[PDB]
Amino acid sequence: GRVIRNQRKGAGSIFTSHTRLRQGAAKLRTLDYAERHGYIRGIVKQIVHDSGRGAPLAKVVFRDPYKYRLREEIFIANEGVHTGQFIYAGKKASLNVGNVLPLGSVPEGTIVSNVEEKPGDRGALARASGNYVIIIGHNPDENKTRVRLPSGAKKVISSDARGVIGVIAGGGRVDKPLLKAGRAFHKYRLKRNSWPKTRGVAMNPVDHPHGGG
Amino acid sequence: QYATVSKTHKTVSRAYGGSRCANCVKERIIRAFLIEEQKIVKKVVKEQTEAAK
Amino acid sequence: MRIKKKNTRGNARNFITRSQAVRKLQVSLADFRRLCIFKGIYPREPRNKKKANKGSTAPTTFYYAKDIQYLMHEPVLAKFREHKTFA
Amino acid sequence: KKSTTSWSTASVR
Amino acid sequence: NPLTHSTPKNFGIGQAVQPKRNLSRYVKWPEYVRVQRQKKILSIRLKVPPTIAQFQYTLDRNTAAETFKLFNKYRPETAAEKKERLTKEAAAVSPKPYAVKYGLNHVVALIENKKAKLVLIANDVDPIELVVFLPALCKKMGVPYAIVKGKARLGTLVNQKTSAVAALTEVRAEDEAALAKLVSTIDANFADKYDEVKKHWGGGILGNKAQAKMDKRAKNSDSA
RNA sequence: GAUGGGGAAGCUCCGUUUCAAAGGCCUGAUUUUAUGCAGGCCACCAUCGAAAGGGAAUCCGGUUAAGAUUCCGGAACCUGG
RNA sequence: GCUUGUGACGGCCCGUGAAAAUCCACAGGAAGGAAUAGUUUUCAUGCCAGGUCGUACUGAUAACCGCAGCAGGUCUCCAAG
RNA sequence: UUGACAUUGUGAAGAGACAUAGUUUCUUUACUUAUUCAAUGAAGCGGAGCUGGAUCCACGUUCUAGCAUUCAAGGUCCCAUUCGGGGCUGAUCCGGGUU
Ligand SMILES: [Mg+2]
Ligand SMILES: [Mg+2]
Ligand SMILES: [Mg+2]
Ligand SMILES: [Mg+2]
Ligand SMILES: [Mg+2]
Ligand SMILES: [Mg+2]
Ligand SMILES: [Mg+2]
Ligand SMILES: [Mg+2]
Ligand SMILES: [Mg+2]
Ligand SMILES: [Mg+2]
Numbered sequence: 001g002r003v004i005r006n007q008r009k010g011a012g013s014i015f016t017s018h019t020r021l022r023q024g025a026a027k028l029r030t031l032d033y034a035e036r037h038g039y040i041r042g043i044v045k046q047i048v049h050d051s052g053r054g055a056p057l058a059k060v061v062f063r064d065p066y067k068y069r070l071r072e073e074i075f076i077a078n079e080g081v082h083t084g085q086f087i088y089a090g091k092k093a094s095l096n097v098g099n100v101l102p103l104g105s106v107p108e109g110t111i112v113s114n115v116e117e118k119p120g121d122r123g124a125l126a127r128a129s130g131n132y133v134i135i136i137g138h139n140p141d142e143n144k145t146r147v148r149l150p151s152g153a154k155k156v157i158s159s160d161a162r163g164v165i166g167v168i169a170g171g172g173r174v175d176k177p178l179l180k181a182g183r184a185f186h187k188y189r190l191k192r193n194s195w196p197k198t199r200g201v202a203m204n205p206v207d208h209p210h211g212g213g
Numbered sequence: 214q215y216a217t218v219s220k221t222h223k224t225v226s227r228a229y230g231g232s233r234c235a236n237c238v239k240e241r242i243i244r245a246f247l248i249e250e251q252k253i254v255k256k257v258v259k260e261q262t263e264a265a266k
Numbered sequence: 267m268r269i270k271k272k273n274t275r276g277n278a279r280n281f282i283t284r285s286q287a288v289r290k291l292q293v294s295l296a297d298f299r300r301l302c303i304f305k306g307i308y309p310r311e312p313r314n315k316k317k318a319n320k321g322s323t324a325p326t327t328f329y330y331a332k333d334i335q336y337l338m339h340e341p342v343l344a345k346f347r348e349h350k351t352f353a
Numbered sequence: 354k355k356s357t358t359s360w361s362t363a364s365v366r
Numbered sequence: 367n368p369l370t371h372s373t374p375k376n377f378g379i380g381q382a383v384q385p386k387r388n389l390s391r392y393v394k395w396p397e398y399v400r401v402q403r404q405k406k407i408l409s410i411r412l413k414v415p416p417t418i419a420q421f422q423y424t425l426d427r428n429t430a431a432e433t434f435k436l437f438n439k440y441r442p443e444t445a446a447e448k449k450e451r452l453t454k455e456a457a458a459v460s461p462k463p464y465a466v467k468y469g470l471n472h473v474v475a476l477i478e479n480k481k482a483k484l485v486l487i488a489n490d491v492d493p494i495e496l497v498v499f500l501p502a503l504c505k506k507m508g509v510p511y512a513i514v515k516g517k518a519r520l521g522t523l524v525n526q527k528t529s530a531v532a533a534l535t536e537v538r539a540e541d542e543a544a545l546a547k548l549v550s551t552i553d554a555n556f557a558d559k560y561d562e563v564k565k566h567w568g569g570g571i572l573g574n575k576a577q578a579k580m581d582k583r584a585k586n587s588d589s590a
Numbered sequence: 591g592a593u594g595g596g597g598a599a600g601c602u603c604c605g606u607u608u609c610a611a612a613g614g615c616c617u618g619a620u621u622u623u624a625u626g627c628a629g630g631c632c633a634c635c636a637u638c639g640a641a642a643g644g645g646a647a648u649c650c651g652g653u654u655a656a657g658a659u660u661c662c663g664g665a666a667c668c669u670g671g
Numbered sequence: 672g673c674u675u676g677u678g679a680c681g682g683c684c685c686g687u688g689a690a691a692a693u694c695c696a697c698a699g700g701a702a703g704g705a706a707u708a709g710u711u712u713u714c715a716u717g718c719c720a721g722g723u724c725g726u727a728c729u730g731a732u733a734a735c736c737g738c739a740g741c742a743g744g745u746c747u748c749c750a751a752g
Numbered sequence: 753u754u755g756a757c758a759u760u761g762u763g764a765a766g767a768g769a770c771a772u773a774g775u776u777u778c779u780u781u782a783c784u785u786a787u788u789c790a791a792u793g794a795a796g797c798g799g800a801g802c803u804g805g806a807u808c809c810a811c812g813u814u815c816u817a818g819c820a821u822u823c824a825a826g827g828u829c830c831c832a833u834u835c836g837g838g839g840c841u842g843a844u845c846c847g848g849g850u851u
Contacts, residue, residue, distance in 0.1 A: 020689060033796050038379035043817060049687055066384050066795070068821035084817040090379075094814065120791060120851090173685050186686040214646085215695040217668085220713045223696060232697040244818040251815085263811070267721050269646065270670045285616065294627045295618065314712080315703085323703040339362045346625080353626045372826040377843065380813040382820065385843070387795075392850050394794045396611045407848060411785050413762065574847045575798050576784070582799090
């Protein structure tokens with residue numbers, strides 16, 4: 001039989017992401033000596049829109065601890081973070097919205113975002129707009145933290161994994177009807193070639209197993 | 214074209230003349246002085262608190 | 267013709283510093299000084315030291331690049347290399 | 354006069 | 367001096383730029399350096415069978431110095447002075463020479479024929495199978511042997527870069543007493559002293575962090 | 591799309607900064623051991639890809655069978671030294 | 672009034688609408704520099720040089736493609752009453 | 753998808769076989785050295801401080817869109833004082849593991 005679109009998408013080709021207008025990959029800082037032992041202060045210089053992403057991003061400038069220069073990082077903006085705000089990242093950072101802390105240093109019920117799955121991977125969980133991770137509890141003997149993910153799942157991760165206090169900005173985006181194939185067109189033009197979609201039943205049996213009749 | 218003109222056309226006679234404007238320069242001067250004074254105050258207060266503690 | 271790069275022609279090519287001369291000769295500083303004394307190579311003063319040293323005012327000993335290039339062909343340098351191998 | 358090899362001297366000061 | 371002031375630097379976290387420090391522990395070395403260091407570490411870590419581990423017991427400094435002092439008097443003839451002998455023999459047309467015997471096959475044959483009075487075996491031979499059988503052969507043939515450190519040292523003994531083995535077969539009358547005393551000294555210091563310990567397995571050593579963790583666990587288990 | 595590497599019997603394939611010892615600069619009479627180079631500093635990757643994207647700087651008058659912001663006359667400008 | 676350039680604005684997005692070569696400036700002050708003599712080629716004037724390749728013409732009911740000097744096809748600028 | 757074999761190593765405890773001297777077999781529990789995954793600027797890892805404060809900490813950084821770079825100033829031993837140059841410290845020690 002003919003190769004279906006689901007199988008065709010694996011070769012790449014015309015199904016790759018449209019990434020010309022992106023601001024850069026959104027990551028935390030590299031887990032270094034300063035964040036492992038104390039804290040480090042950066043400054044929010046601007047909050048910008050990223051093409052293909054619902055949530056805004058924040059440019060945060062830190063000082064290089066080993067060289068006289070500045071380092072720019074792209075964080076995912078939590079709600080309430082403003083330009084000119086000071087952000088503190090490390091084990092000794094305070095419990096304020098926008099700060100980056102290890103999961104073992106926050107109490108139960110804390111709401112975090114851009115949470116590391118493993119210590120040092122620079123953010124993996126609760127990154128989309130309006131989402132967050134809830135700190136359910138701690139297991140100090142195994143140095144573990146139990147958290148609740150946006151999907152409702154319960155996970156156990158390292159207490160050295162880092163997370164940003166607060167909830168990802170831009171929530172409530174999907175509550176507005178698009179009303180228009182044109183608005184869907186402009187939505188997916190900045191993401192990838194997955195729109196419009198043709199139903200398998202409407203195809204021939206050669207094109208799709210659902211075809212025929 | 215900036216390589217063809219004199220330094221008068223590309224600067225003004227002030228600190229950060231060119232790269233920064235007058236109001237921003239004034240604000241950073243004020244911030245520098247006030248924060249340095251506050252640092253001296255905080256160091257004196259911390260030394261007194263260490264002595265009393 | 268495309269636009270040329272600055273600090274490549276004029277004083278910058280006419281004069282060469284002592285460290286650059288030693289590096290090009292691939293000898294030690296003592297060997298370089300002895301070779302200069304043997305061949306009568308003497309330091310020179312550019313009229314525009316900032317042009318010759320890319321805007322630096324630091325004190326520097328300059329030589330003629332042609333003089334160093336002529337010094338590259340001296341057999342006493344090969345004799346020095348042979349003595350090093352013998353040692 | 355002319356060079357036969359890549360490295361020459363020709364002895365002109 | 368009123369013009370000079372004390373301005374200490376804060377090198378803490380979130381403070382002034384860190385100063386230069388010796389980062390030799392964190393150097394990303396070339397791959398050959400890393401390979402040789404990890405190879406030596408692995409040889410230390412793994413449990414070594416006794417036939418290989420016996421080569422880590424060598425002569426001590428004093429006995430090695432005495433042995434090489436004896437052998438340097440019988441250091442073999444060089445190519446420069448051999449031509450001086452050939453011209454002298456041509457004019458006549460030479461006494462019996464005494465020299466250190468070397469070469470692996472030659473020395474093994476001398477040991478098998480019981481002609482070698484003393485054998486010196488280098489410890490750092492790669493591949494090791496070239497000499498791993500030599501102590502047992504010397505023991506079976508009743509030939510006194512000693513493991514010494516440095517095939518380069520044996521090479522300097524026999525006018526080579528390296529030498530896997532050296533052997534003293536015949537000696538002069540002025541040195542027979544010294545040779546007998548050296549044989550007795552090697553018997554006391556190397557054969558009898560290391561007789562039991564060479565039958566054991568080697569390389570039972572952990573790493574630094576592993577040893578620290580094991581010590582901490584043992585201390586915690588013994589005492590709260 | 592090469593190199594360092596790694597696949598493949600192989601024609602060749604992956605990958606594009608990694609998994610590499612991938613290269614430049616400053617100082618020196620280094621307390622002299624006597625004719626052997628010592629002390630330091632900064633660091634990331636070839637090349638190709640637009641005569642509509644980016645980009646140093648020129649205009650007027652005249653001239654030919656057919657050239658023309660290019661020739662001629664006059665008047666400018668840029669780049670490098 | 673027409674065409675066009677431009678300025679301050681306003682509306683729109685679950686769309687917020689390139690990169691790099693290159694140039695300038697700032698912060699810093701390693702340093703260098705005058706008394707009978709120095710400094711400043713980011714002020715003016717004066718001197719020298721600018722290589723290689725393209726450049727005619729058509730661009731269409733006859734100069735391109737459609738077996739043709741084929742009512743077909745083929746991107747764009749200017750534009751009077 | 754499931755099972756076997758090879759890669760495949762090192763200990764402790766409990767049960768077996770030479771008939772109550774340690775040569776092997778089976779479970780449980782450990783270890784790292786093969787192998788596997790990830791990151792970096794292979795920069796701060798592990799252990800200890802007759803180091804200090806109160807088993808834990810660095811009391812070197814949290815009102816502020818400032819600034820932080822020239823082997824680091826200072827302190828202390830020398831030099832042959834002369835434009836300055838060296839040593840210890842500032843900035844604890846040790847490791848045969850970049851994390
Ligand atoms: Mg149909
Ligand atoms: Mg390829
Ligand atoms: Mg190109
Ligand atoms: Mg163009
Ligand atoms: Mg014409
Ligand atoms: Mg002309
Ligand atoms: Mg024309
Ligand atoms: Mg035409
Ligand atoms: Mg045609
Ligand atoms: Mg045709």
